[PDB]
Amino acid sequence: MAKIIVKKSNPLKGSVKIDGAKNAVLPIIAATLLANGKSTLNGVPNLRDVHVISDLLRHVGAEVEYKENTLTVDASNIKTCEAPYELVRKMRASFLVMGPLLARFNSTKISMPGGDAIGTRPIDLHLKGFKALGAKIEMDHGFVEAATEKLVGNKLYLDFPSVGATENIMMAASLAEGTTIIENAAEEPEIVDLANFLNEMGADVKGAGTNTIKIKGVKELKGAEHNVIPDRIEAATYMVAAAMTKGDITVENVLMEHLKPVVAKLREAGCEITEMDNSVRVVGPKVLKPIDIKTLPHPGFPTDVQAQFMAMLTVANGTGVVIETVFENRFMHVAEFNRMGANIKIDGRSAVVNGVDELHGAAVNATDLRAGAALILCGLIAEGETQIGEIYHIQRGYVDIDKKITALGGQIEIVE
Amino acid sequence: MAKIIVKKSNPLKGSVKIDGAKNAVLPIIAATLLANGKSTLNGVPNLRDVHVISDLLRHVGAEVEYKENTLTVDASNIKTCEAPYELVRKMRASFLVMGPLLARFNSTKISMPGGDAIGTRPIDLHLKGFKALGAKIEMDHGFVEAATEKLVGNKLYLDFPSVGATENIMMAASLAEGTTIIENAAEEPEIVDLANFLNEMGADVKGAGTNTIKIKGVKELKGAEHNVIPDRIEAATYMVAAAMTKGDITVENVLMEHLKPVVAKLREAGCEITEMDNSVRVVGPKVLKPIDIKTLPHPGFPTDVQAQFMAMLTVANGTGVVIETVFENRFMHVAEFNRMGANIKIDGRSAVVNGVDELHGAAVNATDLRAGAALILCGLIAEGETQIGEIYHIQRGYVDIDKKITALGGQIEIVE
Amino acid sequence: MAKIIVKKSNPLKGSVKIDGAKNAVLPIIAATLLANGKSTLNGVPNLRDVHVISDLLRHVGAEVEYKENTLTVDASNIKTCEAPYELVRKMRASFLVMGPLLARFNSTKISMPGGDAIGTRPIDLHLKGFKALGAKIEMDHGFVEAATEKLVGNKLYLDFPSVGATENIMMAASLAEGTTIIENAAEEPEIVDLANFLNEMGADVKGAGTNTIKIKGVKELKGAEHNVIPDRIEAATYMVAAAMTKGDITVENVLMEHLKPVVAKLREAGCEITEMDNSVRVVGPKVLKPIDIKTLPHPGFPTDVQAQFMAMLTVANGTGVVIETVFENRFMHVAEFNRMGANIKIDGRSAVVNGVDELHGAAVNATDLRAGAALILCGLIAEGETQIGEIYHIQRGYVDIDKKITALGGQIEIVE
Amino acid sequence: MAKIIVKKSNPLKGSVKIDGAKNAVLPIIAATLLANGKSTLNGVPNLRDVHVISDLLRHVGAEVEYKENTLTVDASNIKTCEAPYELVRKMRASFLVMGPLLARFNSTKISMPGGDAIGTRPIDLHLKGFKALGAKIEMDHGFVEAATEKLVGNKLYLDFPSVGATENIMMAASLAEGTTIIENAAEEPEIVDLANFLNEMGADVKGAGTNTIKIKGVKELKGAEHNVIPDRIEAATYMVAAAMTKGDITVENVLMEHLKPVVAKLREAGCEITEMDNSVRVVGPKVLKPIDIKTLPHPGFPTDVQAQFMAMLTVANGTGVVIETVFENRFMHVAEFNRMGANIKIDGRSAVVNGVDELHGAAVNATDLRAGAALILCGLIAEGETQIGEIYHIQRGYVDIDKKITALGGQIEIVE
Ligand SMILES: CC(=O)N[C@H]1[C@@H](OP(=O)(O)OP(=O)(O)OC[C@H]2O[C@@H](n3ccc(=O)[nH]c3=O)[C@H](O)[C@@H]2O)O[C@H](CO)[C@@H](O)[C@@H]1O[C@H](C)C(=O)O
Ligand SMILES: CC(=O)N[C@H]1[C@@H](OP(=O)(O)OP(=O)(O)OC[C@H]2O[C@@H](n3ccc(=O)[nH]c3=O)[C@H](O)[C@@H]2O)O[C@H](CO)[C@@H](O)[C@@H]1O[C@H](C)C(=O)O
Numbered sequence A, B, C, D: 001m002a003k004i005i006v007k008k009s010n011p012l013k014g015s016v017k018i019d020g021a022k023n024a025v026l027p028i029i030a031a032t033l034l035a036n037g038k039s040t041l042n043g044v045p046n047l048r049d050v051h052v053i054s055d056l057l058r059h060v061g062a063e064v065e066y067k068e069n070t071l072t073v074d075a076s077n078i079k080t081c082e083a084p085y086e087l088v089r090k091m092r093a094s095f096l097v098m099g100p101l102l103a104r105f106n107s108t109k110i111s112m113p114g115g116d117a118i119g120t121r122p123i124d125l126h127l128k129g130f131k132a133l134g135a136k137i138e139m140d141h142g143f144v145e146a147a148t149e150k151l152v153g154n155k156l157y158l159d160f161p162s163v164g165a166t167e168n169i170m171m172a173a174s175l176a177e178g179t180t181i182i183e184n185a186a187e188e189p190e191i192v193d194l195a196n197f198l199n200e201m202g203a204d205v206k207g208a209g210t211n212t213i214k215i216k217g218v219k220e221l222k223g224a225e226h227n228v229i230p231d232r233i234e235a236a237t238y239m240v241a242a243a244m245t246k247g248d249i250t251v252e253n254v255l256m257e258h259l260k261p262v263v264a265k266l267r268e269a270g271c272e273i274t275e276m277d278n279s280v281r282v283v284g285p286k287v288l289k290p291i292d293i294k295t296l297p298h299p300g301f302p303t304d305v306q307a308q309f310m311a312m313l314t315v316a317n318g319t320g321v322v323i324e325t326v327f328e329n330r331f332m333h334v335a336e337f338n339r340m341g342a343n344i345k346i347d348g349r350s351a352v353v354n355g356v357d358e359l360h361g362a363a364v365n366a367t368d369l370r371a372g373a374a375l376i377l378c379g380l381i382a383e384g385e386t387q388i389g390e391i392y393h394i395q396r397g398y399v400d401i402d403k404k405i406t407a408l409g410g411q412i413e414i415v416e
């Protein structure tokens, strides 16, 4: 079955355009279910996960059409409010339809997500929020059911600033009676994008991007047209690629405000970075300086760039420590990096990376979306050739990584 | 030597006035060193740690006068910029004079803090910030020295949203040439109070309380008059006391905006809480519902109320999990709680509290400020009598806890 | 694709015969490569992993024949000493041919194992041991190569009492010149079985099952006939099944000496256990008492029964804590148990299990061998029907679990 | 108050005689309470902790006499079986009189140990064992009471191979009716010494030093004469001193069998070690090679040499990782090492030591017995002078460390 073949490459040089954010568009697609009319989403990335959630919207009876990076949803005449086991198992972001469906129908039944490659990942804080809004919660044979005679706005505190729980509860709150206050809200840029979309549909959401979100519920929302924000994680991936290959890459159609920790840490590692209004230039250093990273809720260092930064550190000039505070098990890639000659030792949530002279190409497997991209970055600097398996992990969340890296001068091909 | 004797008490009832914040006033006292004139701080709590940092200001040559909760500092004619080993060992918040002294003199030498009861507690992020502003850092026999021909404003990223590093770097930045940007800043209320004081002296500090602080440096600051914010941790201590004793307590001279996670979690445990503009009423439940707590950077659940909430949970109606993400070793109190008949098991940063019918009075020792207060709360509900040793831990950070609890109906005395 | 369907079952009752140990036979099959003649292994379990390592022996040029639980190996005329990427990826126990091949040929090249479902799982201690015996170690594009002009016996210390490193180093030492001492050796029963087999071939291995193994190297080993020990993990699985179903099961063809922690902990949970010379009877309690388990090196509680005991605890009468000290990531099953209505919270290496009234059948996926068996145990007690996917995990290490449970009265079928 | 002053020293050279084991003699002194007659213990080290437990024996009514490294106990006419709060707080090894007193009187009441510098340190496994022998356990105001009409031998499993629980339960079992089996027993050398002493008094204890101890109870024990084993931790301290100072030290009156992991790891770091029947010679390397250490139950690497090895690693030629699996909080020394210019970063139970060119003398505080000795070792290699406070930690468990190091050529003095 299919492989990505990467060879030892020249320093990457040129421009790369970044696609629309996967993690902005998935919650915004769920949010289209809130509205009694037709939404138009522009800058949608052509990714399998976008097409899976589209099929979940079709399952509940929305009219969905995709072409040329535009998705339209007519949720006027939704029929059903159950998300079946197969769709939630394909893509756990399926769970983000629970808030809108509860808000629209006052009842919903959603398959509970199971095991995940990067950790246990419970959805208790989502349920906490729905209960605070007056929903009664029951489990039935792997499904979570939430139902109420009417959602009522209430104050609630998030024990952790969960992205998904913030999104699900903001969407449920948008049609509740009265005012909801989410305390200790996630501050991620995708939260702001979602809130902006809800306000475009006629909602009243204030404070997104701060620690407190206030939602004043409205009776009805209407379809709206929205431009999704750029993918800050894809942008960061190409920025790391410039750092690791001693390259010179201009990343186009980005928002620097969303990349601050990645810019800071790449500068600490020795990159020269030029921030512009719609683009950033990254010049890799001749010697990578070892740095430590600690993943945290935004605007701390993002867990979605942890594997990529770890790959950079495998050839840094000394010892770097990577601490993962956000996910339990997000070190599955370490054994694959070690197959390529890295020197990485883990205990608990910390990995000690002892820089080596060079990586060596080897047969490796993608374990998840972001680690698979980290393996491509390893492959560009590893002596010889690297063959990466289980490539569906990568292909589901990066648009045409083979074409984009090829245009920057790298040696990469997908063999089917 | 001295003991606090607590007996099984009646439900606490009445009003308690909260003192000025220890953790607001300590950095604000350091900040008075920035100014060429006389500052006046009102609402200063009469605590030993306030009197120790006052003696450190006298050591560097400031004129300090304390009476009736007002402290005045004339830093016009500071002489020296070294903080010796004895003062830093007495109180590690001594380290917060490093930023102001570097900013005033372009040189400072500060004893590095050593072991602490609640964890290792490095000051690497403070030094990271001073280096970003152009200081060269050297160690000499237990001292850290920072020196520059001139501080220059620069962008810098905090790997963790350290309270102390945020404070130290904001104060150093206030007299630097140009603009400093602190990314991933601490959002704690004391950060806002300090920033407000710097702006009262003539600084230009924007964004305090958000994830990004921008400081535009000025050439000179002038003495100013400031009213310190209330002590949110003392307020939380009395709120927990009402919860544990099935009491009814109005906490006076507080800011509800600063207590949101404590209010939320006490409500989840079954308290009825009435929030007013300058006060909060807490009515304890007849049965405490078990809750989980996870400490986090503000506005997440504060590590400074973790031991007190754990004490509450020792008699809750089931199993509660306490996770400490902020400090390494902040479970030293567990063995003292277990001497009083608690059922607490720890592994790593998590403690599993299995509620018991009642605690039993025993001889126990305060291990640190907030745990010592938690032992007083245990003592109010424990059958018989509790004798608490090593009481300097408590007395250094609570104003007259014996008099305040006595006025709420509790049985407590300090025996010398 | 294929599923295991389990229904809510009657209490299990009857006898079950246990097969030969998977984890005894895999290293003993590698060990047959040490000998210049024909070995005969009896009591070999009919498992896919036995058939994969058999194909690896054929790959290096041994004559292998399997029938009716007997495997014969003629390693007289081995040809090659490389274990390719495909075979090591299929089954990481492939790596155990490295010691014998190094000992026979003074050179070997083995694909380094990559990611694993239950943790990173480095093989550094194996290499440490080969280096101590005089091998030079090099990496080539995902392979580890070990080579020497002659293995020489030496003292070496294991930083952790690794089962695999103990096995690999004992086998390499068996043909070395002089005496090897393994300090802090694994004490697992399979170590003793392997040592007994090496001594049957003419080796000199003393101390297996203690903390120190002494190997005096011989010039030549000869094929021998060996009876593999019973599978203590399969035995423990059926013992837990009796505990969870309030059953009464006699487990046949077992060694009680190998099951001591499982017997102790089942007795603590309320089981009545009768230990006999070749069999054990387990009578489940009417109420399961909550217990804590901490996995450790033998003769501590085995990590290979951790998921199964956790499943038992999901319906115990209170709160149980499971700590995994042996593997990093061995909690992937928790999310599947939670789909069936368990109440399990993890942080770090500890899981807090809050017993529920009953589990509910749901669609779940096996994540690994022992967790998949734990899901079958959940299925026997869960209301309704449970459908388990990814069943190759189970089928590769349990002989006919459907037929054995069916004969004890349970409702289980494999649908293809 | 009192300080230890250490200066930058010459390489240590010469012989040092090791004293009797503190951790052998403390349980053996408790064990003298089992006997109706006079015991004679030879090779007792002249330490404060020996004199505290002696005062506890006097408290319960034993006749105790100490002179010239010989302690005699006549426990013929013991009166009382309570260990009061003051004595247990002075020295938690006081708790080891619980087993003998329960065995002699069928009742005992012992103050429960509270907080400790190196972790929580519960005594649940001791109580588990006493309950298995038929004792009923109750808590009364900080005391644990154990009482029975008669101890009866039973099988029991230790969830962790606790040294103290093994000792306490073996001593209680020695006078029980019938046979006790301790499964997953501690294997530490002090367990063997204690068992040998019990057998000298007329007990029947088999398997000490293995994973299973069988005690066949006797009706009466008689006073006996015993030679305590050497202090393996003191021996290891001087061995590390030779390693760190590039010295050449013969450690006299030791048992190499008890030092295997320390010898192995010092050899891995580059020491040349000569093992003899009663002595070991350690020659420090000119460059220390970085090594990793993981503390474990004997015969794994001892937690009591972890701080000392960490100190060695602060100047090793690269990066070393220290993992503490045995104690929770045993990293309090890290902040003191960092005051001396070390580069140590901790997360969870792991510390990353990045070797520096040299340490610099500074004012530091002992946090516990073994860390305080590690600070002396730092002081011998640190530029200039080191002043160590809180020296009672050191003096309570090392005999004349100033005189022994002075005789090896080091510069050390105690100033009072
Ligand atoms: C669709 C989408 O946006 N997915 C992203 C979002 O996941 P989400 O699931 O919302 O993230 P969280 O809830 O903030 O999870 C953060 C932490 O909080 C715990 N938690 C979360 C929810 C809850 O109810 N209870 C609870 O305990 C949770 O287990 C985790 O440890 O945020 C993550 C963090 O940045 C990203 O890694 C993730 O990308 C992924 C990889 C991808 O592109 O495939
Ligand atoms: C004077 C004062 O305000 N002290 C308070 C302040 O400590 P501070 O020291 O500033 O807190 P941090 O820097 O936010 O520390 C948070 C975490 O960050 C790590 N870190 C901190 C700084 C650095 O350079 N490097 C680094 O790694 C650090 O080790 C810790 O794990 O904030 C703490 C957290 O809320 C409080 O518990 C503390 O109160 C105390 C108890 C009291 O009243 O005695």
Ligand SMILES: CC(=O)N[C@H]1[C@@H](OP(=O)(O)OP(=O)(O)OC[C@H]2O[C@@H](n3ccc(=O)[nH]c3=O)[C@H](O)[C@@H]2O)O[C@H](CO)[C@@H](O)[C@@H]1O[C@H](C)C(=O)O
Residues within 6 Å of the ligand: C023, C024, C026, C093, C119, C120, C121, C122, C123, C124, C125, C126, C127, C160, C161, C162, C163, C164, C165, C186, C302, C303, C304, C326, C327, C328, C369, C397
């Ligand atoms: C074939 C076989 O016998 N496999 C078994 C054996 O694995 P092994 O791999 O030998 O186990 P370890 O080396 O004792 O591993 C124990 C720990 O030691 C770390 N370690 C191991 C080796 C090394 O070089 N370096 C190193 O750090 C390692 O990462 C782990 O955390 O022992 C395990 C522990 O009981 C079993 O779970 C495992 O069964 C499996 C599931 C199955 O049936 O599929």
Ligand SMILES: CC(=O)N[C@H]1[C@@H](OP(=O)(O)OP(=O)(O)OC[C@H]2O[C@@H](n3ccc(=O)[nH]c3=O)[C@H](O)[C@@H]2O)O[C@H](CO)[C@@H](O)[C@@H]1O[C@H](C)C(=O)O
Residues within 6 Å of the ligand: D023, D024, D026, D093, D119, D120, D121, D122, D123, D124, D125, D126, D127, D160, D161, D162, D163, D164, D165, D186, D302, D303, D304, D326, D327, D328, D369, D397
């Ligand atoms: C008097 C004496 O011999 N003391 C020593 C002995 O302590 P002990 O207390 O017996 O050690 P453990 O019981 O083997 O403790 C090991 C681990 O087991 C947990 N545990 C222990 C008992 C129990 O009931 N429950 C439980 O959970 C415990 O918390 C720890 O994490 O063994 C330790 C380990 O080698 C030594 O560090 C210690 O020396 C000291 C420093 C000194 O010289 O001052």
